[PDB]
Design an enzyme around this catalytic site. Structure first.
Site, PDB file in Angstrom:
ATOM      1  CG  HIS A  62      36.446  31.355  39.053  1.00 45.58           C
ATOM      2  ND1 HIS A  62      36.964  32.632  39.068  1.00 45.58           N
ATOM      3  CD2 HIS A  62      36.792  30.798  40.238  1.00 45.58           C
ATOM      4  CE1 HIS A  62      37.599  32.836  40.207  1.00 45.58           C
ATOM      5  NE2 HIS A  62      37.509  31.738  40.937  1.00 45.58           N
ATOM      6  N   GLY A 100      36.628  36.327  43.523  1.00 46.56           N
ATOM      7  CA  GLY A 100      35.396  37.061  43.351  1.00 46.56           C
ATOM      8  C   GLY A 100      35.407  38.225  44.315  1.00 46.56           C
TER       9      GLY A 100
END
Ligand SMILES: COc1ccc(-n2nc(C(F)(F)F)c3c2C(=O)N(c2ccc(C4(CN5CCCC5)CC4)cc2)CC3)cc1
Ligand SMILES: [Ca+2]
Lengths: 52, 234
Positions: B42, B186
């Site tokens: 994402h 992330g």
């Protein structure tokens, strides 16, 4: 208990092969002569906080 | 990172930071080797053009150990879905190799069975990043880290308003004011074992940040180790 008993005395990866404990290490480490400890093969081994 | 402590010199050498066109960090990543960065899928839709900065702990000035690297290849997991964030994993191939030094070093990739049995059964893991220090606050200029306990799978499913798939696990606190947050995504979730740190997760998402009865959601790295191995050869 093998691996279930204190990671089978291995420094890193522990496998139960033929009802016996077998240790291994991540890429960049070398299994030591005692077949348990993991030795860094070069500088800046993975998983180690940089001290010097 | 909400709460936690600042990463002191050399404590989080595997932290990477994705920066946009204006050199602003918008997400994190984990150094896997000299050419590969692990991050969340994402995060790729969070910026058009971006680079990867390593060795940075204070985005306010120029320390000296920082290094930017352009991305050569972006390897996104094709099963990733924007709707549920399932399969939230991507690997980045850098154009030039990272030079390991103080504050710059890879985290180790563990083996599946051992990781799930020995690493994820421990009490806590460690998450880190330059993300918000408060849900409504701004990105942190200082790199932070936070010990987050593993959350029972059943309990987190009951706490979540969104489906917690097999490709994710929960970590954090029920009520305590500490958690990852926007900007940390992330980023690395590592578990320490005998002085060595192994990558165990990827900061994925959460219903707000550090809310009562809510936990942090992380991509389950042990569910993609084979995929990761393959991704680092192309
Ligand atoms: C531990 O790591 C983190 C904990 C929290 C955040 N985080 N901070 C914030 C903010 F600061 F903005 F509050 C937000 C978030 C976040 O992750 N959001 C979110 C993103 C995606 C999802 C979906 C469903 N969504 C897809 C679209 C339909 C609904 C489940 C997949 C649900 C919620 C809300 C905003 C980041 C990392
Ligand atoms: Ca700096």
């Amino acid at each position: 208990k093998l691996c279930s008993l204190d990671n089978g005395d291995c420094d890193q990866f522990c496998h139960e092969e033929q009802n016996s404990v077998v240790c291994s290490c991540a890429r960049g480490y070398t299994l030591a002569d005692n077949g348990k400890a993991c030795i860094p093969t070069g500088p800046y081994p993975c998983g180690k906080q940089t001290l010097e | 990172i909400v709460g936690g402590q600042e990463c002191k010199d050399g404590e989080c050498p595997w932290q990477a930071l994705l920066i946009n066109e204006e050199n602003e960090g918008f997400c994190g990543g984990t150094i896997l080797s000299e050419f590969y960065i692990l991050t969340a899928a994402h995060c790729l839709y969070q910026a058009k053009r971006f680079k990867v900065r390593v060795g940075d702990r204070n985005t306010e000035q120029e320390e000296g150990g920082e290094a930017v690297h352009e991305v050569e290849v972006v390897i996104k997991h094709n099963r990733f879905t924007k709707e549920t964030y399932d399969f939230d994993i991507a690997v980045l191939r850098l154009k030039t190799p990272i030079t390991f030094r103080m504050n710059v070093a890879p985290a180790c990739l563990p083996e599946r069975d051992w990781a799930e049995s020995t690493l994820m059964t421990q009490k806590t893991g460690i998450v880190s990043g330059f993300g918000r220090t408060h849900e409504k606050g701004r990105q942190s200029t200082r790199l932070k880290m936070l010990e987050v306990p593993y959350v029972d799978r059943n309990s987190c499913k009951l706490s979540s308003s969104f489906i917690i798939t097999q490709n994710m696990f929960c970590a954090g606190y029920d009520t305590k004011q500490e958690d990852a947050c926007q900007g940390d995504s992330g980023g690395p979730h590592v578990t320490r074992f005998k002085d060595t740190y192994f990558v165990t997760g990827i900061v994925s998402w959460g219903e707000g940040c550090a809310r009562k009865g809510k936990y942090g959601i992380y991509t389950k790295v042990t569910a993609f180790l084979k995929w990761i191995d393959r991704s680092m050869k192309t």
